[PDB]
Each structure stands twice: as structure tokens, then as C-alpha cells.
Design an enzyme around this catalytic site. Structure first.
Site, short mmCIF file in Angstrom:
data_model
loop_
_atom_site.label_atom_id
_atom_site.label_comp_id
_atom_site.label_asym_id
_atom_site.label_seq_id
_atom_site.Cartn_x
_atom_site.Cartn_y
_atom_site.Cartn_z
CG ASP A 185 74.90 31.64 71.71
OD1 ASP A 185 73.76 31.22 71.95
OD2 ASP A 185 75.43 32.70 72.21
CE1 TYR A 190 76.03 38.59 73.36
CE2 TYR A 190 76.17 36.75 71.86
CZ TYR A 190 75.95 37.25 73.12
OH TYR A 190 75.62 36.35 74.14
CE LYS A 231 72.45 33.89 73.77
NZ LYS A 231 73.52 34.43 72.87
CG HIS A 251 70.55 38.00 75.80
ND1 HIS A 251 71.13 38.61 74.71
CD2 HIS A 251 71.52 37.45 76.59
CE1 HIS A 251 72.43 38.43 74.85
NE2 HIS A 251 72.73 37.73 75.96
#
Ligand SMILES: NC(=O)c1ccc[n+]([C@@H]2O[C@H](COP(=O)([O-])OP(=O)(O)OC[C@H]3O[C@@H](n4cnc5c(N)ncnc54)[C@H](OP(=O)(O)O)[C@@H]3O)[C@@H](O)[C@H]2O)c1
Ligand SMILES: O=C(O)COc1cc(Cl)ccc1C(=O)NCc1cccc([N+](=O)[O-])c1
Length: 316
Positions: A44, A49, A78, A111
Site C-alpha cells: 500500500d 508518503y 492513491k 485518497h
């Protein structure tokens, strides 16, 4: 139990994946390498990130080591909130693909339902602290996601942090091309999500549980927040099964027909966390863990509470 769950696009999704939020780039390449070695086949990811390049370095190495082939992997990313405008979606997806060194994603999620003002900053704020929204809406962003499937960039699309009415908005869209395959939501014994899980499952939407360990490393944690990994009640359940608390917390959602994505960068823990297919939580264990619900959220920003699409005013 079976290691994969069937999605509405006919693809199979591994029920255990590796989370990568807060995995620093300086450590996430080794994490993903180890994860693949010990059997993880679902990773994931997300553009926000800001470690997708290093995740991608691992997948490529393991592909080149002859450890795995691409078809066996299930890579999720996402669309970040600053990219909800229909004209920005494909470029955001293609940046993720380029960073990950992939030619497709297995699953691409909106997201959060909240669109933010486009620009370089991921969380644009105004002078006093509210997020600056964009004039975007769920349905138009969904239509843009659908285009990614029709161009072959992604095999499946879904949503994350959508409440049931927001999901319903997509389901009921005139001219819908693809139903969401997945809703990825926070879920753990302190936020058991009974009503939203029941809703989603009753639509053939698969639910992924994020922050299953309570995200102890979340950067806004307060010392007085409740801590799952240290909860003596859960430790006692773990002890009875000769498992760790983390392994109980990972097995819990699996027995609810959820996908689960625990994060670690620690090689020992990465391996530990995968060793959850060889024991079963009892009926009493399941009931006890569900009884711990407190409606407590790791992920919910104050700063987003005035956004028109803030998901957490609704009960579910
Ligand atoms: N869609 C969304 O909005 C959203 C939001 C939140 C999370 N997510 C996804 O869900 C993933 C998981 O959630 P999360 O990162 O919030 O937190 P989490 O998986 O609940 O917890 C991660 C924390 O637990 C520690 N840990 C891992 N395994 C452990 C074990 N066996 N024993 C003790 N400690 C252990 C990790 O430490 P070390 O890493 O130092 O080992 C890290 O500090 C994310 O990484 C991300 O991929 C998505
Ligand atoms: O979102 C994630 O996957 C994990 O949390 C992250 C991760 C990064 Cl790298 C930075 C910031 C966050 C974060 O504050 N997410 C929460 C959030 C975001 C947007 C809207 C909301 N909201 O409440 O509408 C909440």
C-alpha cells in the site's frame, strides 16, 4: 484462510499487505525487499508518503533477482487531495507510476474525499489554519479515475475515507462506468466500523483496514491517546494464543473478511506480522475485540472539518 479476496473487476487482492506511510526512503527499500522475501504480495503506497521511488527500487530489484514476477504483485496507490481536478488526475497517476517504475497499478484510490487547492503544498492552509479547498466534487473526480481504467493505467479504482453517503453518491451516479472496488478506511478495535463495513460489504465493495495497530508512530499522537499495542486486554488475548499483540490485531480484521495493511520498516516485525495465517481468534476473542470500540480515530484533521466533503460528520 484464503490469502486473496475477489474484487469486482475479477482480480484477486491479497488480504495482507505492507503499509508504507512513515517508512522513511532511507529504510523503506529494505522493508519492501524483506516483505517480498517473506511472502507479502500487496504493498500500500501513496504519492503523499513521498517514498514511492524507493518502494519502486525494491520491486524492481526483486523482479530482477527472479524472486517475484509483476503479475503476482498487487500494488496500490492513491490520488492526493491537491489533484482532484479532472485535468490533474492522469498526471498524478503517471507520476506515481514513474516513481514506482511500473506500467500499471493494481488499484488506485481517491485518497480522501476532500479536494484541496492545487499547488505544490500538500496541505495548503489559510492564515488561520483551515485547509484551502478546491472547487472539485466526488463525482467528477470519480469520472477522472474511471478514465485511468479505460486507458490501462490501473486495473481497479476505489476510494478511501469515504462515508456511506459519499460511497452512495458514486454508486448512484447516472452513467457510472466502474463501481468502486475497495473502500480503504481506518479500522481497529477502537474504531470497529460496524455500520460502514456492513454497508460496503452489502455492495460487494471490499474494505481495507488501515492503521490496524493504531498507528503509534502517527506524528500528531498525544501521550494520553489510547494505545492498542499496549492494551493489556489485547495482550492477554495474544498471550493465550502464543502470538504477539500485533499478530492478534492483524488477524482480527482478516476474520471480518477485510484486507489489512500493517506498516513496519523493522525486518523482524515485517516477518512477524505476516505470520497470521496459522492461528484463529475464537468467537469470544472476536466479540471481545469488537467490544473495545470507542469511535477513536488516528486519522481525522481538525483543519478539514469545515471542508464540504469532510467525511466524519456523518455517523458512518
Ligand atoms: N488511506 C489512508 O488515508 C491511510 C491512512 C493511514 C494509514 N494508511 C495505510 O495503512 C498503513 C498502516 O497504518 P499506519 O502506518 O497508520 O500504522 P499501523 O500499521 O497501525 O502501525 C505502524 C506502527 O506500528 C509499529 N509496528 C509494526 N509492527 C509492529 C509489531 N509487530 N510490534 C510492534 N510495533 C509494530 C511500526 O513500527 P516500525 O515501522 O518502526 O517497525 C509503526 O510505528 C499505512 O502505512 C498506510 O499504508 C492509509
Ligand atoms: O492520509 C494518510 O494516508 C495518512 O495520513 C497522512 C499522511 C501524510 Cl504523509 C501526511 C498527513 C496525513 C494526514 O494528516 N492524513 C489525514 C487527513 C488527510 C486529508 C484529509 C483529512 N480529513 O480529515 O479530511 C485527514
Amino acid at each position: 484462510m484464503a490469502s486473496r479476496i475477489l474484487l469486482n473487476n475479477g482480480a484477486k487482492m491479497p488480504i495482507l499487505g505492507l503499509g508504507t506511510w512513515k517508512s522513511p526512503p532511507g529504510q523503506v527499500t529494505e522493508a519492501v525487499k524483506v516483505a517480498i522475501d517473506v511472502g507479502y504480495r500487496h504493498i500500500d503506497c501513496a504519492h503523499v508518503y513521498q517514498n514511492e521511488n524507493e518502494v519502486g527500487v525494491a520491486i524492481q530489484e526483486k523482479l530482477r533477482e527472479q524472486v517475484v514476477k509483476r503479475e503476482e504483485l498487487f500494488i496500490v496507490s492513491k490520488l492526493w487531495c491537491t489533484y482532484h481536478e479532472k485535468g490533474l488526475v492522469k498526471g498524478a497517476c503517471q507520476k506515481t507510476l514513474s516513481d514506482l517504475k511500473l506500467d500499471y497499478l493494481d488499484l488506485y484510490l481517491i485518497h480522501w474525499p476532500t479536494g484541496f487547492k492545487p499547488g505544490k503544498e500538500f496541505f495548503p492552509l489559510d492564515e488561520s489554519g483551515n485547509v484551502v479547498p478546491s472547487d472539485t466534487n466526488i463525482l467528477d473526480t470519480w469520472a477522472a479515475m474511471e478514465e485511468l481504467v479505460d486507458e490501462g493505467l490501473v486495473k481497479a479504482i476505489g476510494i478511501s475515507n469515504f462515508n456511506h453517503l459519499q460511497v452512495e453518491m458514486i454508486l448512484n451516479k447516472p452513467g457510472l462506468k466502474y463501481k468502486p472496488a475497495v473502500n480503504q478506511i481506518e479500522c481497529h478495535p477502537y474504531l470497529t466500523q460496524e455500520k460502514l463495513i456492513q454497508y460496503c460489504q452489502s455492495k460487494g465493495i471490499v474494505v481495507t483496514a488501515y492503521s490496524p495497530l493504531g498507528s503509534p508512530d502517527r506524528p500528531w499522537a498525544k501521550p494520553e491517546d489510547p494505545s492498542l499495542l499496549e492494551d493489556p486486554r489485547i495482550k492477554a488475548i495474544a498471550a493465550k494464543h502464543n502470538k504477539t499483540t500485533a499478530q492478534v490485531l492483524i488477524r482480527f480484521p482478516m476474520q471480518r473478511n477485510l484486507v489489512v495493511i500493517p506498516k513496519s520498516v523493522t525486518p523482524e516485525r515485517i516477518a512477524e506480522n505476516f505470520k497470521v495465517f496459522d492461528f484463529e481468534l475464537s468467537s469470544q476473542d472476536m466479540t471481545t475485540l469488537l467490544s473495545y470500540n470507542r469511535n477513536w480515530r488516528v486519522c481525522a484533521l481538525l483543519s478539514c472539518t469545515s471542508h464540504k466533503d469532510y467525511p466524519f460528520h456523518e455517523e458512518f
